[PDB]
Amino acid sequence: SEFSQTALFPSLPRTARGTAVVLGNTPAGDKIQYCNGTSVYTVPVGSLTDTEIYTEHSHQTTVAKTSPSGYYCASGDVHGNVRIWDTTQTTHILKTTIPVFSGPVKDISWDSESKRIAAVGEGRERFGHVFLFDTGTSNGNLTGQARAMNSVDFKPSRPFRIISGSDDNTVAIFEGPPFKFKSTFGEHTKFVHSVRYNPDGSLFASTGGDGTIVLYNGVDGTKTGVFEDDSLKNVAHSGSVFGLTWSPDGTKIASASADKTIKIWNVATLKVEKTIPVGTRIEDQQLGIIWTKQALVSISANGFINFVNPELGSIDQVRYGHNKAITALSSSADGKTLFSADAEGHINSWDISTGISNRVFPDVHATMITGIKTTSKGDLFTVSWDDHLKVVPAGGSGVDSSKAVANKLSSQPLGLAVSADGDIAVAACYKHIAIYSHGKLTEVPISYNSSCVALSNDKQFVAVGGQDSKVHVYKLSGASVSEVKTIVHPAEITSVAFSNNGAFLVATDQSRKVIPYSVANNFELAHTNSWTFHTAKVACVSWSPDNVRLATGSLDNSVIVWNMNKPSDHPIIIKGAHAMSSVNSVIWLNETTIVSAGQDSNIKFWNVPF
């Protein structure tokens, strides 16, 4: 009512080296599903801003699958929980939730009728469970394999069957309902990571650590062939195969491997038609893959989403982003570009209007970036816990990190402020106020530990928040500072910002207070009202271009919009702006538009009318 979300640049899937990423998809195949944090993402192969998120799991999400009917989605987590919910409405009403076993769910499978669900993983009491979706009633017994079950799939045609892959190196097949163990197959010599039936259920294939792909008769599970690459010796891949998927017509199979390639195989000839190399880096290993009626997607170890053109044997599109906590944002002066930085030093550029992303490479930092700022000349200023302040030139690749000027800092940078043109940059460090201008770094030692910084638009003031529960305001001339005000807070300062017109300075502290000061009144309190609505640490603050409204992001998952003109009015509270996640950064793109980023790797845009 008082606000609405206009867009989302979604988190990439969570990844773990040498671990499979299982994807789900909608009936039309127009959208895929994957997980990060405690959420389930439904990403369209069409849009880049209309992804949908479902965040009701209380534990780290592992896999999510939408029913053939398309009305429901069954998602599991590391604790063995499987939630079944409506995907059609913004309410996502829970139909059923059930703890299938004590341990992480690794894969889930809906049956053709959308009446049954099979879940496999690492339980103490069992590695798999099959039950009716609406009632939660057991539909059989998946006992049979000795170790964790990594993959599971229903035979889409009658007579119904269920196949599974396990860490015991075996493939198992069950018949029913009620489902019961039928047989085990031992073609594989290492962990089985993926087992899948073709669209008509006449056949299914398996693959895993041994790098081989075996083909089987869908009803009895008798081996009918193996896919081998003529360029290799009796194997399909030169390393572990984390997943395989069938083309819509069932004539081809695509596999994703640790050998950094995606291969398209012809089912009839059992030969590889095309090998699609992603790159030479360990980040290029392929950990998951899925072929829908509208797209073939493969996931890199770095989280990137690769759209494959099976016909041309090439990568059509690649979506970048983040799967680790976003820690800083900056938007271009012209409002067309947004830069985002994360806890692991990765930076992405985004076209604000389209959502198209670009990953800065090589990385500007190998660790935690606590500040980033773009300037009117394309330069990109950054500070990181590798104790450096770097300036990266622009649009030649867009940001040739390869030509960034690095400057070692004396102490850890916790905040960054840079003038519009990049003439002056100031970094609040643990034991210094670092100033960079005209290619020279000057570091003023301070007797307190700073926590944040803000530079006034006219470049005359520098406000430094401190762990001494004080806001130190200085008049700046070159790298020479003169303190003109020391503002006392009841707790440690967490963030600061000057309004564009320089009329106000706002500071937030660990007591959860948000306090603005009148610069014209020598930094005296602008109002007596207590703006203490956040129920958790305030992590960031930013002013609207109107110099009246401001916004704060907090560890309590919300963004709050404050109004300097009506201090006693209740503020606008976007509750759960970033569900189960802290809002680390916020910026006003215009008088009624805010962009937020959180620990959840999500970047959200909000419209907040006057």
XYZ file of C-alpha atoms in Angstrom:
610
model
C 0.000 0.000 0.000
C 2.608 2.536 1.106
C 5.204 0.844 -1.117
C 5.777 -1.923 -3.661
C 8.729 -3.891 -5.053
C 9.297 -3.100 -8.720
C 12.170 -5.461 -9.536
C 14.670 -8.093 -8.380
C 18.238 -8.989 -9.514
C 18.335 -12.430 -7.815
C 20.978 -14.354 -5.975
C 22.735 -17.055 -7.985
C 22.437 -20.633 -6.716
C 24.458 -21.729 -3.706
C 27.435 -23.865 -4.721
C 29.987 -26.075 -2.996
C 33.116 -27.338 -4.722
C 32.679 -30.920 -5.903
C 28.984 -30.868 -4.984
C 25.933 -31.267 -7.223
C 23.437 -28.440 -7.695
C 19.954 -29.822 -8.369
C 17.539 -27.687 -10.352
C 13.788 -27.813 -10.734
C 11.573 -26.309 -13.409
C 8.009 -25.319 -14.248
C 5.784 -27.373 -16.615
C 6.125 -24.963 -19.527
C 9.876 -25.050 -18.931
C 9.860 -21.254 -19.001
C 11.359 -21.082 -15.504
C 13.968 -22.968 -13.462
C 14.336 -23.272 -9.696
C 17.390 -23.345 -7.424
C 18.302 -22.418 -3.872
C 20.539 -20.202 -1.756
C 20.227 -19.254 1.929
C 16.813 -20.358 3.185
C 15.090 -19.458 -0.085
C 13.814 -21.041 -3.265
C 14.190 -19.026 -6.455
C 11.946 -19.404 -9.472
C 13.878 -17.779 -12.287
C 12.342 -17.230 -15.726
C 14.501 -17.895 -18.783
C 12.672 -14.905 -20.163
C 12.777 -12.012 -17.666
C 15.760 -10.778 -15.590
C 13.707 -8.845 -13.034
C 10.652 -11.043 -12.464
C 12.208 -13.939 -10.564
C 10.020 -15.066 -7.667
C 11.325 -15.953 -4.228
C 9.900 -18.222 -1.565
C 11.515 -17.942 1.843
C 9.737 -19.966 4.510
C 12.310 -22.658 5.278
C 14.029 -22.094 8.622
C 17.072 -24.023 7.393
C 19.414 -23.786 4.418
C 17.606 -24.847 1.291
C 18.985 -27.705 -0.893
C 16.523 -28.592 -3.723
C 13.102 -27.506 -5.059
C 10.799 -29.112 -7.651
C 7.507 -27.910 -9.146
C 4.799 -30.491 -9.837
C 3.796 -31.481 -13.396
C 0.501 -29.791 -12.552
C 2.449 -26.623 -11.823
C 0.312 -25.674 -8.804
C 2.761 -26.939 -6.202
C 6.445 -26.966 -5.364
C 8.168 -29.377 -3.008
C 11.356 -27.944 -1.524
C 13.734 -29.535 0.961
C 16.459 -28.303 3.312
C 19.566 -29.461 5.183
C 17.406 -30.599 8.094
C 15.293 -33.115 6.212
C 12.239 -30.910 5.885
C 10.148 -30.957 2.721
C 7.636 -28.128 2.322
C 4.877 -28.296 -0.295
C 3.364 -24.943 -1.222
C 1.195 -23.032 -3.700
C 3.320 -21.396 -6.397
C 0.437 -19.549 -8.077
C -0.321 -16.886 -5.479
C 1.785 -14.307 -3.680
C 0.526 -16.064 -0.494
C 2.289 -19.363 -1.294
C 0.012 -21.114 1.175
C 1.656 -24.196 2.691
C -0.138 -27.417 1.789
C 2.058 -29.805 3.743
C 5.409 -29.918 5.484
C 7.107 -33.117 6.587
C 10.445 -34.185 8.059
C 11.451 -37.014 5.714
C 14.653 -37.933 7.648
C 17.326 -36.312 9.904
C 19.796 -34.965 7.450
C 19.895 -32.940 4.232
C 17.461 -33.623 1.408
C 19.547 -34.038 -1.770
C 16.865 -34.579 -4.413
C 13.090 -34.629 -4.776
C 10.802 -36.069 -7.428
C 7.116 -35.573 -8.201
C 5.255 -38.412 -9.911
C 3.433 -37.843 -13.223
C 0.057 -37.471 -11.491
C 1.382 -34.833 -9.077
C 0.093 -37.013 -6.236
C 3.327 -38.550 -4.997
C 6.686 -37.202 -3.851
C 9.968 -39.049 -3.381
C 12.724 -37.476 -1.278
C 16.265 -38.786 -0.838
C 19.288 -37.683 1.194
C 21.258 -38.280 4.419
C 19.015 -39.551 7.201
C 19.895 -41.467 10.362
C 16.752 -43.601 10.081
C 16.577 -43.741 6.281
C 18.037 -42.274 3.058
C 14.717 -41.875 1.247
C 10.958 -41.590 1.656
C 7.971 -41.678 -0.712
C 4.600 -40.211 0.334
C 1.311 -38.676 -0.841
C 1.659 -34.888 -1.176
C -1.671 -33.754 0.287
C -1.832 -36.226 3.186
C 1.823 -36.912 3.945
C 0.911 -40.595 4.068
C 3.729 -43.030 3.268
C 3.373 -44.677 -0.160
C 6.031 -47.331 0.240
C 9.527 -48.050 1.510
C 12.706 -46.797 -0.138
C 15.032 -49.054 1.898
C 17.725 -50.721 -0.236
C 20.919 -48.669 -0.575
C 23.628 -48.547 2.101
C 24.655 -44.899 1.838
C 23.200 -41.447 1.252
C 20.915 -41.272 -1.768
C 21.882 -38.366 -4.003
C 19.385 -38.555 -6.847
C 15.832 -39.814 -7.316
C 13.280 -39.829 -10.147
C 9.828 -41.301 -10.886
C 9.141 -43.176 -14.124
C 6.721 -40.811 -15.934
C 4.811 -43.742 -17.421
C 3.059 -46.812 -16.067
C 4.001 -49.276 -14.786
C 5.402 -46.753 -12.294
C 8.983 -47.096 -11.072
C 11.365 -45.050 -8.919
C 15.128 -44.980 -9.521
C 17.854 -43.576 -7.270
C 21.606 -43.036 -7.105
C 23.656 -43.455 -3.912
C 27.082 -42.866 -2.334
C 27.303 -46.664 -2.236
C 28.062 -46.550 -5.957
C 24.765 -48.164 -6.872
C 21.655 -47.350 -8.849
C 18.421 -48.726 -7.415
C 14.981 -49.270 -8.882
C 11.680 -49.597 -7.013
C 8.288 -50.747 -8.256
C 4.827 -49.756 -7.058
C 2.703 -48.250 -5.646
C 3.034 -49.075 -2.911
C 6.721 -48.691 -3.730
C 9.188 -51.363 -2.650
C 12.801 -52.229 -3.449
C 13.133 -54.130 -6.713
C 16.817 -54.299 -7.647
C 20.228 -52.666 -7.536
C 22.634 -52.171 -10.439
C 26.404 -51.930 -10.121
C 27.696 -50.488 -13.379
C 29.264 -47.545 -11.508
C 32.473 -47.612 -9.465
C 32.099 -44.295 -7.630
C 29.359 -42.079 -6.144
C 26.245 -41.911 -8.322
C 25.224 -38.251 -8.682
C 22.415 -38.309 -11.227
C 19.696 -40.705 -12.420
C 16.938 -39.543 -14.766
C 14.185 -40.988 -16.972
C 13.550 -39.722 -20.495
C 10.234 -37.910 -21.187
C 8.351 -41.077 -22.166
C 9.897 -43.220 -19.439
C 11.109 -45.934 -21.817
C 14.694 -45.402 -20.634
C 16.756 -43.792 -17.890
C 20.445 -42.962 -17.491
C 22.942 -42.696 -14.650
C 26.262 -40.987 -14.023
C 28.608 -39.949 -11.244
C 32.164 -39.759 -10.002
C 33.579 -42.452 -12.294
C 32.942 -40.193 -15.283
C 30.693 -42.653 -17.114
C 27.098 -42.458 -18.312
C 25.054 -45.666 -18.533
C 21.763 -46.166 -20.402
C 19.041 -48.520 -19.081
C 15.649 -49.961 -20.053
C 13.120 -47.853 -18.127
C 10.920 -50.683 -16.877
C 13.431 -53.292 -15.638
C 16.639 -51.285 -15.438
C 18.668 -53.525 -17.734
C 21.728 -51.825 -19.233
C 21.275 -51.033 -22.924
C 24.416 -48.994 -23.566
C 27.094 -46.545 -22.430
C 28.009 -43.112 -23.757
C 31.716 -42.884 -24.458
C 33.745 -39.985 -25.857
C 36.001 -41.210 -28.679
C 38.634 -38.739 -27.487
C 38.818 -40.403 -24.054
C 39.430 -43.975 -22.904
C 36.121 -45.742 -22.094
C 34.532 -42.753 -20.302
C 32.162 -39.947 -21.127
C 33.987 -37.267 -19.130
C 37.512 -36.713 -17.805
C 36.170 -36.148 -14.319
C 33.141 -36.489 -12.081
C 29.785 -35.933 -13.797
C 27.497 -34.000 -11.467
C 24.357 -34.184 -13.559
C 22.592 -35.237 -16.740
C 19.304 -34.233 -18.339
C 17.228 -35.252 -21.372
C 16.189 -33.063 -24.278
C 12.413 -32.509 -24.616
C 12.148 -34.999 -27.486
C 14.290 -37.552 -25.665
C 16.768 -37.849 -28.540
C 19.671 -36.198 -26.728
C 21.249 -36.050 -23.265
C 23.322 -33.214 -21.787
C 25.833 -33.788 -18.999
C 27.686 -31.369 -16.681
C 31.151 -32.333 -15.428
C 33.966 -31.322 -13.128
C 36.131 -31.470 -16.305
C 34.786 -27.930 -17.054
C 32.541 -28.939 -19.997
C 29.001 -29.635 -20.984
C 28.527 -32.424 -23.508
C 25.520 -33.030 -25.743
C 25.042 -36.720 -26.544
C 23.017 -38.438 -29.241
C 20.965 -41.170 -27.570
C 20.691 -43.242 -30.766
C 24.413 -43.366 -31.595
C 25.585 -43.093 -27.970
C 28.237 -40.633 -29.189
C 28.996 -37.071 -28.159
C 27.665 -34.545 -30.685
C 29.259 -31.524 -29.040
C 31.610 -30.703 -26.164
C 31.006 -27.161 -24.801
C 33.979 -25.936 -22.670
C 33.144 -23.274 -20.150
C 36.691 -22.227 -19.295
C 40.038 -23.271 -17.796
C 39.384 -22.175 -14.202
C 38.316 -24.355 -11.301
C 35.332 -21.978 -11.146
C 34.346 -23.339 -14.549
C 33.561 -26.868 -13.324
C 29.870 -27.575 -14.086
C 27.891 -28.692 -11.039
C 24.319 -29.007 -12.235
C 22.262 -28.979 -15.397
C 18.678 -29.090 -16.623
C 17.053 -29.207 -20.058
C 13.560 -27.700 -20.221
C 11.179 -27.363 -23.159
C 12.508 -23.812 -23.454
C 16.157 -23.928 -22.393
C 19.211 -25.955 -21.468
C 20.998 -24.463 -18.470
C 24.246 -25.481 -16.775
C 25.575 -24.116 -13.466
C 29.245 -23.242 -12.903
C 31.037 -23.812 -9.582
C 31.078 -20.013 -9.206
C 27.287 -19.915 -9.392
C 27.024 -18.492 -12.921
C 24.037 -19.646 -14.984
C 25.058 -20.775 -18.476
C 22.443 -20.975 -21.235
C 23.555 -23.550 -23.784
C 22.682 -23.643 -27.476
C 22.692 -27.440 -27.989
C 22.586 -27.059 -31.778
C 25.646 -24.828 -32.111
C 27.437 -26.332 -29.110
C 28.060 -22.950 -27.508
C 27.116 -20.815 -24.517
C 24.324 -18.424 -25.527
C 24.037 -16.334 -22.384
C 25.527 -16.207 -18.904
C 23.849 -14.619 -15.865
C 26.240 -13.351 -13.183
C 25.435 -11.985 -9.746
C 26.277 -13.188 -6.282
C 25.604 -16.174 -4.049
C 27.518 -14.647 -1.069
C 26.416 -11.655 1.055
C 26.369 -8.327 -0.795
C 28.247 -5.733 1.239
C 28.248 -2.534 -0.837
C 26.465 -0.707 -3.640
C 26.917 2.355 -5.790
C 24.801 3.622 -8.718
C 26.143 5.791 -11.554
C 25.353 9.502 -11.480
C 23.154 9.085 -14.570
C 21.239 6.315 -12.811
C 21.778 3.774 -15.584
C 24.268 1.495 -13.851
C 24.501 -0.220 -10.474
C 27.642 -1.797 -9.012
C 27.432 -4.435 -6.274
C 30.236 -5.926 -4.147
C 30.244 -8.972 -1.860
C 31.901 -10.585 1.145
C 34.309 -12.493 -1.090
C 35.547 -9.554 -3.151
C 33.426 -10.137 -6.260
C 31.957 -7.162 -8.142
C 29.147 -7.047 -10.709
C 27.824 -4.255 -12.913
C 24.077 -4.203 -13.622
C 21.983 -2.362 -16.165
C 19.410 -0.860 -13.794
C 16.557 -1.000 -16.304
C 17.106 -4.469 -17.799
C 18.770 -6.459 -15.022
C 21.515 -7.672 -17.348
C 24.693 -8.284 -15.395
C 28.444 -8.369 -16.007
C 31.009 -9.874 -13.650
C 34.170 -7.828 -13.155
C 37.119 -10.076 -13.977
C 39.655 -10.530 -12.718
C 38.396 -9.808 -9.201
C 39.553 -6.467 -7.820
C 39.867 -8.003 -4.348
C 40.078 -11.556 -3.030
C 38.139 -10.669 0.077
C 35.467 -8.572 1.869
C 34.740 -5.320 0.179
C 33.337 -2.727 2.605
C 32.833 0.100 0.147
C 32.447 0.881 -3.534
C 31.751 4.153 -5.383
C 31.470 4.968 -9.077
C 32.315 8.495 -10.307
C 31.445 10.925 -13.101
C 34.490 9.704 -15.010
C 33.772 5.985 -14.960
C 36.347 5.222 -12.259
C 35.409 2.644 -9.617
C 36.725 3.215 -6.080
C 36.907 0.261 -3.691
C 38.178 -0.663 -0.220
C 38.550 -4.176 1.151
C 39.795 -6.137 4.144
C 42.917 -6.977 2.147
C 43.774 -3.475 3.455
C 43.891 -1.715 0.116
C 42.042 1.141 -1.548
C 41.853 0.652 -5.301
C 40.723 2.829 -8.183
C 39.596 0.930 -11.273
C 39.239 2.724 -14.635
C 36.136 2.265 -16.804
C 34.285 1.318 -19.973
C 37.221 -0.269 -21.805
C 35.852 -3.661 -20.844
C 33.716 -1.537 -18.597
C 36.070 -1.820 -15.642
C 39.563 -3.066 -16.446
C 40.386 -4.305 -12.938
C 43.626 -5.273 -14.651
C 44.630 -1.523 -14.597
C 43.468 -0.467 -11.125
C 45.816 1.582 -9.000
C 46.201 -0.163 -5.652
C 47.079 1.674 -2.448
C 47.978 -0.217 0.726
C 46.150 1.150 3.778
C 47.658 1.322 7.283
C 44.581 -0.134 8.995
C 41.358 -1.911 7.991
C 38.817 0.079 5.935
C 35.269 -0.024 7.341
C 33.617 2.676 5.223
C 34.161 4.699 2.065
C 32.997 8.074 0.748
C 34.025 9.569 -2.597
C 33.085 12.877 -4.252
C 31.054 12.896 -7.494
C 34.103 13.366 -9.736
C 36.432 11.225 -7.637
C 38.525 14.248 -6.689
C 38.468 13.220 -3.019
C 38.004 9.800 -1.456
C 37.971 9.167 2.286
C 38.119 5.791 3.980
C 37.215 5.326 7.643
C 39.815 2.842 8.932
C 40.255 1.075 12.293
C 43.095 3.416 13.292
C 43.169 6.052 10.540
C 41.133 8.426 8.415
C 42.597 7.697 4.984
C 42.432 10.412 2.362
C 43.115 9.888 -1.337
C 43.348 12.748 -3.812
C 45.508 13.523 -6.828
C 47.157 10.110 -6.729
C 48.409 10.431 -3.146
C 47.221 8.597 -0.035
C 47.493 10.441 3.285
C 46.476 8.746 6.508
C 45.601 10.819 9.573
C 46.016 8.788 12.757
C 43.052 8.854 15.126
C 42.815 7.975 18.823
C 39.522 6.107 18.399
C 38.438 3.291 16.076
C 36.166 4.472 13.252
C 33.229 2.500 11.837
C 31.805 4.571 8.979
C 32.261 7.779 6.995
C 30.423 10.379 4.919
C 31.743 13.264 2.816
C 29.505 16.324 2.294
C 28.572 17.118 -1.301
C 30.484 20.460 -1.251
C 33.519 18.453 0.014
C 33.880 20.683 3.093
C 32.849 18.193 5.760
C 33.857 14.654 6.675
C 31.746 12.849 9.278
C 33.427 9.839 10.876
C 31.393 7.480 13.047
C 33.308 5.846 15.868
C 33.344 2.778 18.071
C 33.733 5.355 20.842
C 30.000 6.036 20.431
C 30.758 9.428 18.886
C 30.354 11.099 15.504
C 33.447 13.125 14.679
C 32.810 15.923 12.191
C 35.817 17.570 10.555
C 36.372 20.442 8.137
C 38.601 19.129 5.323
C 41.428 20.957 3.354
C 43.601 18.600 1.298
C 44.341 15.863 3.796
C 44.300 18.310 6.710
C 41.359 17.973 9.087
C 39.981 20.247 11.795
C 37.333 18.792 14.076
C 34.369 21.142 14.377
C 31.955 18.847 16.210
C 31.933 15.727 18.383
C 28.432 14.266 18.659
C 27.744 11.856 21.518
C 25.525 8.814 21.062
C 24.375 6.236 23.624
C 26.038 3.479 21.583
C 28.579 2.811 18.817
C 27.926 4.526 15.478
C 26.968 2.110 12.672
C 26.420 4.423 9.685
C 26.342 7.995 8.323
C 25.230 10.189 5.487
C 24.911 13.888 4.620
C 21.853 15.007 2.647
C 22.754 16.144 -0.873
C 22.034 19.799 -0.069
C 24.237 19.562 3.004
C 21.437 20.628 5.347
C 21.456 17.428 7.386
C 23.798 14.790 8.803
C 22.252 11.534 9.999
C 23.899 8.917 12.199
C 22.688 5.510 13.406
C 24.049 3.671 16.469
C 23.960 0.186 18.011
C 21.113 1.218 20.334
C 19.079 1.138 17.104
C 18.558 4.905 17.072
C 18.448 6.944 13.845
C 19.453 10.538 14.625
C 19.521 13.471 12.145
C 21.300 16.750 12.940
C 20.827 20.262 11.564
C 24.083 21.340 9.929
C 22.816 24.913 9.921
C 22.337 24.638 13.746
C 25.893 23.539 14.254
C 24.879 19.910 14.192
C 22.287 20.169 16.948
C 19.405 17.669 17.043
C 16.969 18.256 14.176
C 14.101 16.909 16.298
C 13.617 15.345 19.718
C 11.603 12.359 18.534
C 13.184 8.983 18.988
C 13.326 7.138 15.701
C 13.933 3.698 17.264
C 11.694 1.377 15.317
C 14.299 -1.120 14.125
C 14.390 -4.275 16.212
C 17.946 -5.028 15.145
C 21.226 -3.369 14.183
C 20.882 -0.538 11.671
C 23.483 -1.346 9.010
C 23.151 1.456 6.460
C 21.484 4.814 5.799
C 20.945 6.923 2.685
C 19.123 10.171 1.806
C 16.490 10.757 -0.848
C 17.436 13.409 -3.451
C 14.721 15.541 -1.875
C 16.821 16.141 1.288
C 13.742 15.288 3.371
C 13.259 11.558 3.313
C 15.944 9.030 4.186
C 16.118 5.249 4.421
C 17.806 2.740 6.702
C 18.568 -0.949 6.166
C 18.772 -3.280 9.153
C 19.718 -6.778 10.289
C 15.957 -7.175 11.129
C 15.238 -7.774 7.409
C 13.614 -4.359 6.771
C 14.062 -1.079 5.129
C 12.481 1.924 6.853
C 11.712 5.224 5.153
C 11.857 8.226 7.476
C 10.425 11.723 6.956
C 12.257 14.745 8.381
C 9.150 16.944 8.001
C 6.873 14.816 10.289
C 9.222 13.396 12.967
C 6.388 12.134 15.115
C 4.691 10.331 12.216
C 5.032 6.556 12.027
C 7.669 5.736 9.384
C 7.160 3.558 6.307
C 8.299 0.059 7.276
C 9.039 -2.446 4.514
C 8.927 -5.506 6.772
C 10.978 -8.438 5.507
C 12.354 -6.401 2.594
C 14.976 -9.161 2.538
C 13.364 -12.149 4.255
C 15.535 -13.742 6.947
C 18.377 -11.475 5.915
C 20.082 -8.232 6.835
C 19.809 -5.248 4.513
C 23.457 -4.212 4.133
C 23.097 -1.363 1.670
C 20.420 1.071 0.473
C 20.468 3.894 -2.065
C 17.829 6.244 -3.434
C 17.799 6.245 -7.237
C 15.273 9.089 -7.174
C 12.757 10.814 -4.899
C 10.480 7.743 -4.945
C 12.824 4.864 -5.765
C 15.077 2.804 -3.505
C 17.402 -0.093 -4.253
C 18.410 -2.459 -1.453
C 20.909 -5.305 -1.220
C 21.309 -7.914 1.458
C 23.201 -10.752 3.063
C 20.912 -12.922 0.914
C 22.705 -11.927 -2.336
C 19.492 -10.256 -3.541
C 19.191 -6.754 -4.989
C 15.688 -5.280 -4.761
C 14.064 -2.132 -6.135
C 11.206 -0.394 -4.312
C 8.737 2.309 -5.279
C 7.824 4.484 -2.290
C 5.275 7.147 -3.318
C 5.071 10.441 -1.455
